[PDB]
Design a protein around this nucleic acid. Sequence first.
RNA 1: UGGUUCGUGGAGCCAUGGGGGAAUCUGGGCGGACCACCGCCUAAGGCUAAGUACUCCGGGUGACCGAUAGCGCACCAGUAC
RNA 2: GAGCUAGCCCUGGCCAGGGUGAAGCUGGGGUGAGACCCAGUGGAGGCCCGAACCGGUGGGGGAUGCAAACCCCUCGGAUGA
RNA 3: GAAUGCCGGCAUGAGUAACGAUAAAGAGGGUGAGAAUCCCUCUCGCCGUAAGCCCAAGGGUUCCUACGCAAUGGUCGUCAGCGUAGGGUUAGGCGGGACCUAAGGUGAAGCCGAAAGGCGUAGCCGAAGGGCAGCCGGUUAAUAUUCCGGCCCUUCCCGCAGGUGCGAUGGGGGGACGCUCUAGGCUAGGGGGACCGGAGCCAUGGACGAGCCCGGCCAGAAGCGCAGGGUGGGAGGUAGGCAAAUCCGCCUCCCAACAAGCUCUGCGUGGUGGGGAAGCCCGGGUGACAACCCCCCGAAGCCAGGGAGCCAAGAAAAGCCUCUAAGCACAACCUGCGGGAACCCGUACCGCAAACCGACACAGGUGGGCGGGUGCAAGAGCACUCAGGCGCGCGGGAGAACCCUCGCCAAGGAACUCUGCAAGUUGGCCCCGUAACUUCGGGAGAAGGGGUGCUCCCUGGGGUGAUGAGCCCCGGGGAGCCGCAGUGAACAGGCUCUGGCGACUGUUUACCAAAAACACAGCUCUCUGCGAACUCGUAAGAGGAGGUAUAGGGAGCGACGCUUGCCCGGUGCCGGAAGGUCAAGGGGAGGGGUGCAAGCCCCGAACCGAAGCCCCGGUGAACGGCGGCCGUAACUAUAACGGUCCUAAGGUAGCGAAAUUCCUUGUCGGGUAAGUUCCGACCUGCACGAAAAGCGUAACGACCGGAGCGCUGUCUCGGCGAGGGACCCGGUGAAAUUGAACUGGCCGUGAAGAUGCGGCCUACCCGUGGCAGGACGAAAAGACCCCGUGGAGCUUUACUGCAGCC
RNA 4: UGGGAGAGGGUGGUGGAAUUCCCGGAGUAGCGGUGAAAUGCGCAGAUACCGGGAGGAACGCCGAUGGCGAAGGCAGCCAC
RNA 5: CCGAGGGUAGGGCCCGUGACUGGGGCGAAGUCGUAACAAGGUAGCUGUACCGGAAGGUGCGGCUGGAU
RNA 6: GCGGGGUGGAGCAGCCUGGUAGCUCGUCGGGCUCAUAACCCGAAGGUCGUCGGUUCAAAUCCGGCCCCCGCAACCA
Lengths: 275, 48
Amino acid sequence: AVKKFKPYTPSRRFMTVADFSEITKTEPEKSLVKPLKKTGGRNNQGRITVRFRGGGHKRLYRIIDFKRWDKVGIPAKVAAIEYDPNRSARIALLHYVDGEKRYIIAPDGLQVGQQVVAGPDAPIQVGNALPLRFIPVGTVVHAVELEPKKGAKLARAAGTSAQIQGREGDYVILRLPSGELRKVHGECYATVGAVGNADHKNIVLGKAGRSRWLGRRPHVRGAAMNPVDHPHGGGEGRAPRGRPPASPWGWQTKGLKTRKRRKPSSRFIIARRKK
Amino acid sequence: MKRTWQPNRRKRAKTHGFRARMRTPGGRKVLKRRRQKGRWRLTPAVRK
RNA sequence: UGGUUCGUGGAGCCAUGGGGGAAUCUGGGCGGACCACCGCCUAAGGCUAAGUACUCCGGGUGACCGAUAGCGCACCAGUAC
RNA sequence: GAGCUAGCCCUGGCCAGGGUGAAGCUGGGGUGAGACCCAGUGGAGGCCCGAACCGGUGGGGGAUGCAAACCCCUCGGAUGA
RNA sequence: GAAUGCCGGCAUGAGUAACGAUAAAGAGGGUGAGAAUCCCUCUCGCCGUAAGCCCAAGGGUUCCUACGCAAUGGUCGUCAGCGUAGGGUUAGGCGGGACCUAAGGUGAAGCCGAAAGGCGUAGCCGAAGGGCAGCCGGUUAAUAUUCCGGCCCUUCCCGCAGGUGCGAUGGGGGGACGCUCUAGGCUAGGGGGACCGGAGCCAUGGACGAGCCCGGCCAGAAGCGCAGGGUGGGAGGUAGGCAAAUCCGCCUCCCAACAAGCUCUGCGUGGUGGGGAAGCCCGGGUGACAACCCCCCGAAGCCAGGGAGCCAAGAAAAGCCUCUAAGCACAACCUGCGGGAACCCGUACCGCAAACCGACACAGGUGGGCGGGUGCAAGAGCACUCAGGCGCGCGGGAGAACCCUCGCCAAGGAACUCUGCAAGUUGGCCCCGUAACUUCGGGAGAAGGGGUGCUCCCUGGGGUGAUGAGCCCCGGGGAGCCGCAGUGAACAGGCUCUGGCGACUGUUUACCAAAAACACAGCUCUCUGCGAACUCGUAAGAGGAGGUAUAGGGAGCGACGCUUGCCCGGUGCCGGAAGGUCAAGGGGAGGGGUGCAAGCCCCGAACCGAAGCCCCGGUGAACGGCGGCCGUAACUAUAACGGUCCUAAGGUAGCGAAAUUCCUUGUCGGGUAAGUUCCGACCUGCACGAAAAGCGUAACGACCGGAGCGCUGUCUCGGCGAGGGACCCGGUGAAAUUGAACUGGCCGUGAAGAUGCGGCCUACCCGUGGCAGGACGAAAAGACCCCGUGGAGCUUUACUGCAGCC
RNA sequence: UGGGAGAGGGUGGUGGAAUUCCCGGAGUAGCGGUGAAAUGCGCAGAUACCGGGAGGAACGCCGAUGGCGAAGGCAGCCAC
RNA sequence: CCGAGGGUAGGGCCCGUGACUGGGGCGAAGUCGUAACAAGGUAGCUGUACCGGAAGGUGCGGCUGGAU
RNA sequence: GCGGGGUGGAGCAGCCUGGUAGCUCGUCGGGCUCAUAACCCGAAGGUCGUCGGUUCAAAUCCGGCCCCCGCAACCA
Ligand SMILES: [K+]
Ligand SMILES: [Mg+2]
Ligand SMILES: [Mg+2]
Ligand SMILES: [Mg+2]
Ligand SMILES: [Mg+2]
Ligand SMILES: [Mg+2]
Ligand SMILES: [Mg+2]
Ligand SMILES: [Mg+2]
Ligand SMILES: [Mg+2]
Ligand SMILES: [Mg+2]
Ligand SMILES: [Mg+2]
Ligand SMILES: [Mg+2]
Ligand SMILES: [Mg+2]
Ligand SMILES: [Mg+2]
Ligand SMILES: [Mg+2]
Ligand SMILES: [Mg+2]
Ligand SMILES: [Mg+2]
Ligand SMILES: [Mg+2]
Ligand SMILES: [Mg+2]
Ligand SMILES: [Mg+2]
Ligand SMILES: [Mg+2]
Ligand SMILES: [Mg+2]
Ligand SMILES: [Mg+2]
Ligand SMILES: [Mg+2]
Ligand SMILES: [Mg+2]
Ligand SMILES: [Mg+2]
Ligand SMILES: [Mg+2]
Ligand SMILES: [Mg+2]
Ligand SMILES: [Mg+2]
Ligand SMILES: [Mg+2]
Ligand SMILES: [Mg+2]
Ligand SMILES: [Mg+2]
Ligand SMILES: [Mg+2]
Ligand SMILES: [Mg+2]
Ligand SMILES: [Mg+2]
Ligand SMILES: [Mg+2]
Ligand SMILES: [Mg+2]
Ligand SMILES: [Mg+2]
Ligand SMILES: [Mg+2]
Ligand SMILES: [Mg+2]
Ligand SMILES: [Mg+2]
Ligand SMILES: [Mg+2]
Ligand SMILES: [Mg+2]
Ligand SMILES: [Mg+2]
Ligand SMILES: [Mg+2]
Ligand SMILES: [Mg+2]
Ligand SMILES: [Mg+2]
Ligand SMILES: [Mg+2]
Ligand SMILES: [Mg+2]
Ligand SMILES: [Mg+2]
Ligand SMILES: [Mg+2]
Ligand SMILES: [Mg+2]
Ligand SMILES: [Mg+2]
Ligand SMILES: [Mg+2]
Ligand SMILES: [Mg+2]
Ligand SMILES: [Mg+2]
Ligand SMILES: [Mg+2]
Ligand SMILES: [Mg+2]
Ligand SMILES: [Mg+2]
Ligand SMILES: [Mg+2]
Ligand SMILES: [Mg+2]
Ligand SMILES: [Mg+2]
Ligand SMILES: [Mg+2]
Ligand SMILES: [Mg+2]
Ligand SMILES: [Mg+2]
Ligand SMILES: [Mg+2]
Ligand SMILES: [Mg+2]
Ligand SMILES: [Mg+2]
Ligand SMILES: [Mg+2]
Ligand SMILES: [Mg+2]
Ligand SMILES: [Mg+2]
Ligand SMILES: [Mg+2]
Ligand SMILES: [Mg+2]
Ligand SMILES: [Mg+2]
Ligand SMILES: [Mg+2]
Ligand SMILES: [Mg+2]
Ligand SMILES: [Mg+2]
Ligand SMILES: [Mg+2]
Ligand SMILES: [Mg+2]
Ligand SMILES: [Mg+2]
Ligand SMILES: [Mg+2]
Ligand SMILES: [Mg+2]
Ligand SMILES: [Mg+2]
Ligand SMILES: [Mg+2]
Ligand SMILES: [Mg+2]
Ligand SMILES: [Mg+2]
Ligand SMILES: [Mg+2]
Ligand SMILES: [Mg+2]
Ligand SMILES: [Mg+2]
Ligand SMILES: [Mg+2]
Ligand SMILES: [Mg+2]
Ligand SMILES: [Mg+2]
Ligand SMILES: [Mg+2]
Ligand SMILES: [Mg+2]
Ligand SMILES: [Mg+2]
Ligand SMILES: [Mg+2]
Ligand SMILES: [Mg+2]
Ligand SMILES: [Mg+2]
Ligand SMILES: [Mg+2]
Ligand SMILES: [Mg+2]
Ligand SMILES: [Mg+2]
Ligand SMILES: [Mg+2]
Ligand SMILES: [Mg+2]
Ligand SMILES: [Mg+2]
Ligand SMILES: [Mg+2]
Ligand SMILES: [Mg+2]
Ligand SMILES: [Mg+2]
Ligand SMILES: [Mg+2]
Ligand SMILES: [Mg+2]
Ligand SMILES: [Mg+2]
Ligand SMILES: [Mg+2]
Ligand SMILES: [Mg+2]
Ligand SMILES: [Mg+2]
Ligand SMILES: [Mg+2]
Ligand SMILES: [Mg+2]
Ligand SMILES: [Mg+2]
Ligand SMILES: [Mg+2]
Ligand SMILES: [Mg+2]
Ligand SMILES: [Mg+2]
Ligand SMILES: [Mg+2]
Ligand SMILES: [Mg+2]
Ligand SMILES: [Mg+2]
Ligand SMILES: [Mg+2]
Ligand SMILES: [Mg+2]
Ligand SMILES: [Mg+2]
Ligand SMILES: [Mg+2]
Ligand SMILES: [Mg+2]
Ligand SMILES: [Mg+2]
Ligand SMILES: [Mg+2]
Ligand SMILES: [Mg+2]
Ligand SMILES: [Mg+2]
Ligand SMILES: [Mg+2]
Ligand SMILES: [Mg+2]
Ligand SMILES: [Mg+2]
Ligand SMILES: [Mg+2]
Ligand SMILES: [Mg+2]
Ligand SMILES: [Mg+2]
Ligand SMILES: [Mg+2]
Ligand SMILES: [Mg+2]
Ligand SMILES: [Mg+2]
Ligand SMILES: [Mg+2]
Ligand SMILES: [Mg+2]
Ligand SMILES: [Mg+2]
Ligand SMILES: [Mg+2]
Ligand SMILES: [Mg+2]
Ligand SMILES: [Mg+2]
Ligand SMILES: [Mg+2]
Ligand SMILES: [Mg+2]
Ligand SMILES: [Mg+2]
Ligand SMILES: [Mg+2]
Ligand SMILES: [Mg+2]
Ligand SMILES: [Mg+2]
Ligand SMILES: [Mg+2]
Ligand SMILES: [Mg+2]
Ligand SMILES: [Mg+2]
Ligand SMILES: [Mg+2]
Ligand SMILES: [Mg+2]
Ligand SMILES: [Mg+2]
Ligand SMILES: [Mg+2]
Ligand SMILES: [Mg+2]
Ligand SMILES: [Mg+2]
Ligand SMILES: [Mg+2]
Ligand SMILES: [Mg+2]
Ligand SMILES: [Mg+2]
Ligand SMILES: [Mg+2]
Ligand SMILES: [Mg+2]
Ligand SMILES: [Mg+2]
Ligand SMILES: [Mg+2]
Ligand SMILES: [Mg+2]
Ligand SMILES: [Mg+2]
Ligand SMILES: [Mg+2]
Ligand SMILES: [Mg+2]
Ligand SMILES: [Mg+2]
Ligand SMILES: [Mg+2]
Ligand SMILES: [Mg+2]
Ligand SMILES: [Mg+2]
Ligand SMILES: [Mg+2]
Ligand SMILES: [Mg+2]
Ligand SMILES: [Mg+2]
Ligand SMILES: [Mg+2]
Ligand SMILES: [Mg+2]
Ligand SMILES: [Mg+2]
Ligand SMILES: [Mg+2]
Ligand SMILES: [Mg+2]
Ligand SMILES: [Mg+2]
Ligand SMILES: [Mg+2]
Ligand SMILES: [Mg+2]
Ligand SMILES: [Mg+2]
Ligand SMILES: [Mg+2]
Ligand SMILES: [Mg+2]
Ligand SMILES: [Mg+2]
Ligand SMILES: [Mg+2]
Ligand SMILES: [Mg+2]
Ligand SMILES: [Mg+2]
Ligand SMILES: [Mg+2]
Ligand SMILES: [Mg+2]
Ligand SMILES: [Mg+2]
Ligand SMILES: [Mg+2]
Ligand SMILES: [Mg+2]
Ligand SMILES: [Mg+2]
Ligand SMILES: [Mg+2]
Ligand SMILES: [Mg+2]
Ligand SMILES: [Mg+2]
Ligand SMILES: [Mg+2]
Ligand SMILES: [Mg+2]
Ligand SMILES: [Mg+2]
Ligand SMILES: [Mg+2]
Ligand SMILES: [Mg+2]
Ligand SMILES: [Mg+2]
Ligand SMILES: [Mg+2]
Ligand SMILES: [Mg+2]
Ligand SMILES: [Mg+2]
Ligand SMILES: [Mg+2]
Ligand SMILES: [Mg+2]
Ligand SMILES: [Mg+2]
Ligand SMILES: [Mg+2]
Ligand SMILES: [Mg+2]
Ligand SMILES: [Mg+2]
Ligand SMILES: [Mg+2]
Ligand SMILES: [Mg+2]
Ligand SMILES: [Mg+2]
Ligand SMILES: [Mg+2]
Ligand SMILES: [Mg+2]
Ligand SMILES: [Mg+2]
Ligand SMILES: [Mg+2]
Ligand SMILES: [Mg+2]
Ligand SMILES: [Mg+2]
Ligand SMILES: [Mg+2]
Ligand SMILES: [Mg+2]
Ligand SMILES: [Mg+2]
Ligand SMILES: [Mg+2]
Ligand SMILES: [Mg+2]
Ligand SMILES: [Mg+2]
Ligand SMILES: [Mg+2]
Ligand SMILES: [Mg+2]
Ligand SMILES: [Mg+2]
Ligand SMILES: [Mg+2]
Ligand SMILES: [Mg+2]
Ligand SMILES: [Mg+2]
Ligand SMILES: [Mg+2]
Ligand SMILES: [Mg+2]
Ligand SMILES: [Mg+2]
Ligand SMILES: [Mg+2]
Ligand SMILES: [Mg+2]
Ligand SMILES: [Mg+2]
Ligand SMILES: [Mg+2]
Ligand SMILES: [Mg+2]
Ligand SMILES: [Mg+2]
Ligand SMILES: [Mg+2]
Ligand SMILES: [Mg+2]
Ligand SMILES: [Mg+2]
Ligand SMILES: [Mg+2]
Ligand SMILES: [Mg+2]
Ligand SMILES: [Mg+2]
Ligand SMILES: [Mg+2]
Ligand SMILES: [Mg+2]
Ligand SMILES: [Mg+2]
Ligand SMILES: [Mg+2]
Ligand SMILES: [Mg+2]
Ligand SMILES: [Mg+2]
Ligand SMILES: [Mg+2]
Ligand SMILES: [Mg+2]
Ligand SMILES: [Mg+2]
Ligand SMILES: [Mg+2]
Ligand SMILES: [Mg+2]
Ligand SMILES: [Mg+2]
């Protein structure tokens, strides 16, 4: 439930912040955090390989459990729900009856003080994790492994979810957050429910300063540069593109498909994404 | 105004120093050249 | 594809990155596509002085210089700066 | 060669004083319950005025300079990209 | 003899400019061969959030003392950061190392690359971060938390005593963290005292006073006191913390809880050790048995890992504590006490500058700490001033033009000019009051106005203390006094109306552009299913991201409001298992060379044969494009209407002589005495138009227009005055330039603009202050133009390759 | 106090019919549409037929000249 | 002291006028088409939305003041 | 300066490739209609801007001249 401000500055006009309602605990679990190594968009050569990155707030990484089949049968309680600066979704702290503590990403509606569990026999209930084959067709689901035991890769962002459309041999059919229809192996785990913090996309940054806080440095247009820099560089006064719109490196950027043609997973993608 | 030489003993020793030269193929030829020419000092003076 | 005088040329020979893939003398390579005949040679292991090149070094000698010349330096110079 | 300069990374430091008075909270009023209104509290902000600090708007001077970019007056930012 | 030749030497400009901040000097006395310049004294001025003091970096003897003055010092020099010599830097506790980790670097394992080399886990290195035990005074010509004195503390070794399951590079706890705001109590620091100590002073009209002037503390172990921080206790179960575990985590039970206890830190006290002014007398002696007390103000510092709120969600590792494992429990560890042991490097001096970076003793640049007092609303602002430090390493005169910086000016008041450029004006605080418009915040310090000193009397509330006195903090009312003037000096907005552009705060061409340019939140298209797309790399490997479509890349547009029309024929991209074309390869009709022959050898048609291209579609917030001629209404004029040609389709809404309009100062209206600009309209828009967005928009702007009020030396139109120069004298003494020069005017001539040729005219020889018309004056082998089968950046449906991709 | 009828309203759930699209099968020269046609779709295999899947919207028969609500209006079925 | 009024500054209401612009009423015999009255040749009317020289057209929902 | 145009009354074919003037509208006569238009049936009208040349022959090919739109006019 996004929060607004009164127009007492030019930027507070439109700025919106998250309500942080679900958050019940405001400093992380010391045994589950390690330093995030900020890159600036630079690789081991020292070179910028992703432009316009750097200078954001300092962060601690929170170790998330993306393989809940680690602890089949052992139930856990939802101890708290916390802010996580490294993802859009919120996270939940779990106190296993084992004594072990872990983070998962928090699904929508998950309430503190409830039990969650993982395994083939687990109840179809928000926060539980099962191999896809044991989840009923029609169930909305998140944090989905793409291959068995390799880790949750799909539907992790705030508010996202995938839905089960049917089964076919060792595989189930998923509708991904993007709209694509894909076969995913039945032994892949998935947590039932959708990811929470769905109001996330309604946040209005409001000023250039907030982009900077997030580590996003200013993005300069191709049209604003010179020919040595970019296909759209140069021109006396303003210029339209004067060629098919390109990236800094020369390839076309309105419509050119870039998925590799002979990729083996093509055999598992039924229908390309919607919209 | 602020000029370009801003001395720094750590900076000098780590950049032009003896051990910096020996670590690199091009650094070694510098020493080899400066010896062949008979330079009284192969490497910049810095008090460390 | 490289080497050769050979820049695709009638293009052999020597070498070899890729594919196919033998034989032991009645075996195999060469003589400028290729074939016959007539000859030369014995691949896919390796070593080998001398005659040849150079001059940091030492000596000998100049129709070589003689301090703006001769080495950048005749002198505390690869120095001062 | 990044001891100048541009960006990023790690780790420290700095920003006199004054002004404006958001949300929230409290009390009062209001209503079926509300919205909401008033007062007090509160102390938000690429908010306001202005030093340090960072700048370099206009003019004057300087022009074999004090200076291979400086000096004087004036002016911009000053809790933030 | 010439090459703007090379190297060196010496001229000219010239006794010329200059002598490096306009904070400022004068005299007396010394020294010496020599004194504006060295030393001393008195007077004067300058800094005082420094121009004073303490660190760090960098510098590297420049520090102290003696003896010197050739050169260095912009003059001088007896002086010096200069020459010569001798001396000088003292640590278990300060800083760094024998401790830890950050980025990063390196790198047993491992991976990759023609060679060289590139990666890379652990580990190791790496600091201004973590951790860790010394405070006060004295002493030297020069070092001092280092030497000395006093009082304290740490680690290592060995020993004794008491205690304990001891033991780790392994497990766990802790270390351990942001921004803004902020409580209580303290300390640093400061103000005052009619109290305490002090050499003295009484002037020039008055004062022997409850007078003046000076000072009135610093450190400290245990204990104690005040203020804080940190922390629940016991028990049963236990499958997790990669072995074990009595620890930690999880569940249950009892008790505790805004406490208390235990523990830790700050502050106060504290045995003890220190310090101690003015003034006088010669750094010292006295003062002095110095006194060392009370009240107030009071931190941004301390208690601290305190409290609250917020979102952008805020290092690691060691020391330390706990758990145990091998092992060992004659051990070993913990605690107390004792003796012993305790290494290496730095330490001088400069340090906003004459010792660092700028070729210079250069008006520039250089990070951290302390930075006193009074008054002005506050303050690190401003004026003066303490401690302390300076007068800036040429001076002395003169009193011209002209230049710079500064002050004033009759009447007028923008008439100046491209432009009010510049300079006036306004100016702080308190109160009154405040418009269009608006996104309801604002616009707003709108505008405009009143007040402001001093004296006496009355009174209201707060802090400390005690509730009172005292001190300090906010005030309220009444009556008076003086001046031209009361923020009496210094610091401190001119305002209003109306357009264009850009929403806004920001950003930029270091050193001629700060803007309307870039960025920006926001909108749209498009790519990407994760070993993602994309980017860097030959690769390995990285980034993307320890992210996962509410995400990540690319592109355009640029808050917000209302909107964004028509064309898919060409180019692009997307879809299309057909068809056409199509390389290597497959296939081998049919030939060919050679041989006696088996054979060996070469060419080779039909036919099968990818991507690409062709072909069929789609697609505009993809590249892009959005007509011509003729006629027509009952005054005229103009055409709602019609005809026909062409196109893929013929520009919609909105706007329009515009940052776009050529003709153009279009035409009309407004403003003005007068308006090529401005504003409002009209529409034949040379040549607006809808995300290279269209039309608007409150607020914002050192942006660019136009107008008005205020006020002025901008101007009519100039005058006077000040200081620094210019001028004169003493000292030191450049520069570009320069074929040589004995270097005049006119009218002609001349390669067409003559001091130099002709004719005439004029003119004794040589300087100094000035002015710039000429010497086609100086500077820079024109940066425009052309030429060179000269070069370089950039573009593309120029050519030809290559990466990459298929 | 005891009873009744009802598409009165709000929430969560859920059922079948049909249209469209996608995959498989089978199959050939047209389908569609109109007053008649043309555009359009179809040998790149359409229409018509069968099996499978996805998705949205509206609830046939009951149904009435019916019922409920203050009006606007309210119709598959179930529970609250 | 108050005080007619004068002056400086800023507001509010009314009237008059203004390049140009918007639609409106009216005017014997203009141009364009034919929306409505008959099922007016697409039943009409309607609130709203979008489009078009013009009357109007179309969408969504509503009314009968609808013919048969 | 370079480019393309001028043909029945209107707007366009024919020009390149010499002999053949064509399309829609309009106009004139008739028809339907009470009447007009729409609609149906017939018909007329151009010697191709002009002058000159090549040719057996010129709208056509080549030269002037008259005219009409269009593009250009840059470096200082
Ligand atoms: K030019
Ligand atoms: Mg808001
Ligand atoms: Mg509001
Ligand atoms: Mg939340
Ligand atoms: Mg940790
Ligand atoms: Mg990371
Ligand atoms: Mg990373
Ligand atoms: Mg690396
Ligand atoms: Mg490197
Ligand atoms: Mg990139
Ligand atoms: Mg980057
Ligand atoms: Mg994320
Ligand atoms: Mg989160
Ligand atoms: Mg799978
Ligand atoms: Mg969003
Ligand atoms: Mg961030
Ligand atoms: Mg962005
Ligand atoms: Mg941009
Ligand atoms: Mg550009
Ligand atoms: Mg540009
Ligand atoms: Mg470049
Ligand atoms: Mg290029
Ligand atoms: Mg390019
Ligand atoms: Mg371009
Ligand atoms: Mg451009
Ligand atoms: Mg342009
Ligand atoms: Mg273009
Ligand atoms: Mg392109
Ligand atoms: Mg690509
Ligand atoms: Mg897809
Ligand atoms: Mg600077
Ligand atoms: Mg600089
Ligand atoms: Mg530096
Ligand atoms: Mg250093
Ligand atoms: Mg250093
Ligand atoms: Mg360094
Ligand atoms: Mg290095
Ligand atoms: Mg080195
Ligand atoms: Mg090497
Ligand atoms: Mg030597
Ligand atoms: Mg070297
Ligand atoms: Mg060769
Ligand atoms: Mg050959
Ligand atoms: Mg081979
Ligand atoms: Mg043989
Ligand atoms: Mg043989
Ligand atoms: Mg051979
Ligand atoms: Mg041979
Ligand atoms: Mg042979
Ligand atoms: Mg052999
Ligand atoms: Mg042999
Ligand atoms: Mg030999
Ligand atoms: Mg010599
Ligand atoms: Mg010599
Ligand atoms: Mg000689
Ligand atoms: Mg030699
Ligand atoms: Mg020499
Ligand atoms: Mg020697
Ligand atoms: Mg020497
Ligand atoms: Mg540096
Ligand atoms: Mg500040
Ligand atoms: Mg105020
Ligand atoms: Mg208040
Ligand atoms: Mg509160
Ligand atoms: Mg601000
Ligand atoms: Mg203000
Ligand atoms: Mg300036
Ligand atoms: Mg000025
Ligand atoms: Mg001056
Ligand atoms: Mg200059
Ligand atoms: Mg200056
Ligand atoms: Mg100034
Ligand atoms: Mg200012
Ligand atoms: Mg300011
Ligand atoms: Mg401030
Ligand atoms: Mg000669
Ligand atoms: Mg030369
Ligand atoms: Mg020379
Ligand atoms: Mg000489
Ligand atoms: Mg010379
Ligand atoms: Mg000389
Ligand atoms: Mg001479
Ligand atoms: Mg001379
Ligand atoms: Mg002279
Ligand atoms: Mg000079
Ligand atoms: Mg000077
Ligand atoms: Mg000055
Ligand atoms: Mg002064
Ligand atoms: Mg005197
Ligand atoms: Mg004197
Ligand atoms: Mg002297
Ligand atoms: Mg003297
Ligand atoms: Mg003296
Ligand atoms: Mg002061
Ligand atoms: Mg001397
Ligand atoms: Mg002398
Ligand atoms: Mg001398
Ligand atoms: Mg001497
Ligand atoms: Mg000298
Ligand atoms: Mg000097
Ligand atoms: Mg002497
Ligand atoms: Mg010394
Ligand atoms: Mg000691
Ligand atoms: Mg030592
Ligand atoms: Mg040792
Ligand atoms: Mg290192
Ligand atoms: Mg280390
Ligand atoms: Mg350290
Ligand atoms: Mg220490
Ligand atoms: Mg101590
Ligand atoms: Mg002392
Ligand atoms: Mg341990
Ligand atoms: Mg912590
Ligand atoms: Mg942490
Ligand atoms: Mg830290
Ligand atoms: Mg905050
Ligand atoms: Mg104290
Ligand atoms: Mg202090
Ligand atoms: Mg005080
Ligand atoms: Mg006092
Ligand atoms: Mg004490
Ligand atoms: Mg256990
Ligand atoms: Mg025990
Ligand atoms: Mg005594
Ligand atoms: Mg501070
Ligand atoms: Mg303290
Ligand atoms: Mg603290
Ligand atoms: Mg680490
Ligand atoms: Mg044992
Ligand atoms: Mg034993
Ligand atoms: Mg013990
Ligand atoms: Mg040692
Ligand atoms: Mg020392
Ligand atoms: Mg300074
Ligand atoms: Mg400093
Ligand atoms: Mg000095
Ligand atoms: Mg020096
Ligand atoms: Mg000086
Ligand atoms: Mg200086
Ligand atoms: Mg004081
Ligand atoms: Mg003040
Ligand atoms: Mg002076
Ligand atoms: Mg003088
Ligand atoms: Mg004079
Ligand atoms: Mg003058
Ligand atoms: Mg001055
Ligand atoms: Mg003046
Ligand atoms: Mg006067
Ligand atoms: Mg006057
Ligand atoms: Mg005036
Ligand atoms: Mg006036
Ligand atoms: Mg004017
Ligand atoms: Mg004038
Ligand atoms: Mg101007
Ligand atoms: Mg003024
Ligand atoms: Mg003032
Ligand atoms: Mg107004
Ligand atoms: Mg108002
Ligand atoms: Mg307005
Ligand atoms: Mg308002
Ligand atoms: Mg006010
Ligand atoms: Mg008063
Ligand atoms: Mg007075
Ligand atoms: Mg002001
Ligand atoms: Mg006004
Ligand atoms: Mg205004
Ligand atoms: Mg702007
Ligand atoms: Mg701009
Ligand atoms: Mg705009
Ligand atoms: Mg805007
Ligand atoms: Mg904007
Ligand atoms: Mg700002
Ligand atoms: Mg700015
Ligand atoms: Mg510039
Ligand atoms: Mg420039
Ligand atoms: Mg420059
Ligand atoms: Mg400038
Ligand atoms: Mg500019
Ligand atoms: Mg600006
Ligand atoms: Mg820019
Ligand atoms: Mg922009
Ligand atoms: Mg903007
Ligand atoms: Mg927008
Ligand atoms: Mg979007
Ligand atoms: Mg690459
Ligand atoms: Mg990663
Ligand atoms: Mg509006
Ligand atoms: Mg198109
Ligand atoms: Mg198309
Ligand atoms: Mg197309
Ligand atoms: Mg034969
Ligand atoms: Mg093909
Ligand atoms: Mg086009
Ligand atoms: Mg429209
Ligand atoms: Mg116009
Ligand atoms: Mg005009
Ligand atoms: Mg306009
Ligand atoms: Mg235009
Ligand atoms: Mg014009
Ligand atoms: Mg004009
Ligand atoms: Mg005019
Ligand atoms: Mg007119
Ligand atoms: Mg007028
Ligand atoms: Mg007109
Ligand atoms: Mg465009
Ligand atoms: Mg444009
Ligand atoms: Mg505006
Ligand atoms: Mg605006
Ligand atoms: Mg601005
Ligand atoms: Mg501006
Ligand atoms: Mg103006
Ligand atoms: Mg004006
Ligand atoms: Mg004047
Ligand atoms: Mg004046
Ligand atoms: Mg004067
Ligand atoms: Mg002299
Ligand atoms: Mg001299
Ligand atoms: Mg001569
Ligand atoms: Mg002569
Ligand atoms: Mg003469
Ligand atoms: Mg003469
Ligand atoms: Mg002539
Ligand atoms: Mg002459
Ligand atoms: Mg003469
Ligand atoms: Mg002559
Ligand atoms: Mg003669
Ligand atoms: Mg003569
Ligand atoms: Mg003569
Ligand atoms: Mg004469
Ligand atoms: Mg003279
Ligand atoms: Mg003169
Ligand atoms: Mg002259
Ligand atoms: Mg002149
Ligand atoms: Mg001249
Ligand atoms: Mg000349
Ligand atoms: Mg001249
Ligand atoms: Mg020049
Ligand atoms: Mg040259
Ligand atoms: Mg030249
Ligand atoms: Mg030149
Ligand atoms: Mg140039
Ligand atoms: Mg030329
Ligand atoms: Mg050529
Ligand atoms: Mg040529
Ligand atoms: Mg060339
Ligand atoms: Mg019922
Ligand atoms: Mg077909
Ligand atoms: Mg077929
Ligand atoms: Mg669907
Ligand atoms: Mg009167
Ligand atoms: Mg009429
Ligand atoms: Mg009708
Ligand atoms: Mg009709
Ligand atoms: Mg009809
Ligand atoms: Mg009808
Ligand atoms: Mg329509
Ligand atoms: Mg035609
Ligand atoms: Mg033709
Ligand atoms: Mg005809
Ligand atoms: Mg008729
Ligand atoms: Mg003829
Ligand atoms: Mg003819
Ligand atoms: Mg004919
Ligand atoms: Mg040009
Ligand atoms: Mg020109
Ligand atoms: Mg010119």
